[PDB]
Design a protein around this nucleic acid. Structure first.
Lengths: 50, 50, 156, 50
DNA sequence: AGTACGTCCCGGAAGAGATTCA
DNA sequence: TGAATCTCTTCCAGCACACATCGGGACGTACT
RNA sequence: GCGAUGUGUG
């Protein structure tokens, strides 16, 4: 039922919606949002558990 | 407030007025020089926010 | 210190320069900034680094130019005070050893090597508040006492 | 079992790390303009933020 | 030499979406 | 079509003490 | 001769 409620149906527009919740207003950009979501759970820099 | 020293623990009101005045003065100096519209917009925006 | 009077030629030149800066350079600067922001938005983008540095520099230069244009005042004396190298004349001083200068008293902003090399800032010119055709302008330069016999003064 | 105790050690470590991530920014900045060896690291480092 | 002086900056509750019996 | 039922987001959380620290940095210079 | 934060008192 969640997947039913989903508005989007691809990696592209998925990342789009994510970037849209993160930085409101600003227009999207494919590789921009790509790198963004890459820079939230998958890099030494801005995320870490000890 | 003259603190004991060569400084002054300025009240926030002072600094605020100060910012406003700098902003208004740059705006004044711009208009007479017909600087471009993007600049004057950024100017007015900073002013409103100030 | 910094004499708030500058040449009218310098004023016109700096005005045209700031016009060209805020009218031409800033637009392409912002365009390059946006193009770097296109999917870059990172701390590794050398393009974005150069763009931001140039943006800060352009901002500082524009602020300084606007301040000099408004607060200061222009001064370009005519040859009415000819001979008088107080202002408005490319005056020259010879030396006994070959230190021959030939410049005009210009402000501390439009300092270059396109018309002269003089400035109202150093005492070596501050002692020259109003010169003549035979003034023995001597001073204690930064590495010893220097001197120059005024050999020519005229405007153009 | 889910609360955790830090100590001066952890505090210093973490905050000192924040200091180094402060400095590294300008570090890499000035490295960008890097010229041939006429400099030394202390030229491209500033303790003052740390 | 190195700087004191320059600028530069959890509960509530009510509104605007926004959703659903028509 | 339109009156109900969610849902972001502004506003307030006791009184009176006592004492304590701390309050710009940064960037750039005409000199000191 | 101000404000922040903390500590303690009832």
């Amino acid at each position: 039922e969640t997947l039913r409620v989903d508005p989007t149906n691809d990696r592209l527009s998925a990342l789009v919606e994510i970037y849209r919740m993160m930085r409101p207003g600003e227009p999207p950009t494919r590789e921009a949002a790509e790198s963004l979501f890459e820079n939230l759970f998958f890099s030494e820099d801005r995320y870490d558990l000890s | 407030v003259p603190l004991d020293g060569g400084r002054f623990a300025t009240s926030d009101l002072n600094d605020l007025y100060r910012r406003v005045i700098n902003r208004n003065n740059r705006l004044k100096r711009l208009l007479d020089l017909a600087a471009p519209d993007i600049i004057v917009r950024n100017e007015k925006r900073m002013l409103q926010e100030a | 210190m910094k004499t708030p009077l500058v040449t009218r030629e310098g004023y016109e030149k700096l005005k045209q320069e700031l016009n060209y800066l805020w009218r031409e350079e800033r637009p392409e600067v912002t365009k390059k900034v946006t193009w770097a922001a296109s999917l870059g938005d990172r701390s590794e983008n050398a393009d974005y680094q150069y763009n931001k540095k140039r943006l800060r520099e352009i901002d500082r230069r524009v602020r300084y130019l606007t301040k000099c244009m408004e607060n200061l005042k222009i001064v370009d004396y005519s040859p009415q005070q000819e001979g008088k190298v107080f202002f408005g004349a490319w005056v020259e001083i010879e030396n006994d050893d070959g230190v021959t200068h030939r410049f005009r008293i210009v402000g501390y902003d439009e300092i270059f090597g396109r018309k002269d090399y003089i400035s109202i800032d150093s005492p070596m010119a501050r002692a020259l508040l109003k010169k003549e055709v035979g003034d023995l302008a001597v001073v204690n330069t930064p590495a010893g006492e220097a001197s120059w016999y005024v050999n020519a003064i005229e405007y153009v | 079992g889910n609360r955790r105790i830090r100590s001066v050690g952890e505090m210093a470590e973490n905050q000192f790390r924040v200091g180094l991530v402060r400095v590294e920014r300008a570090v890499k900045e000035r490295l960008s303009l890097g010229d041939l060896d006429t400099l030394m690291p202390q030229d491209m480092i500033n303790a003052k933020p740390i």
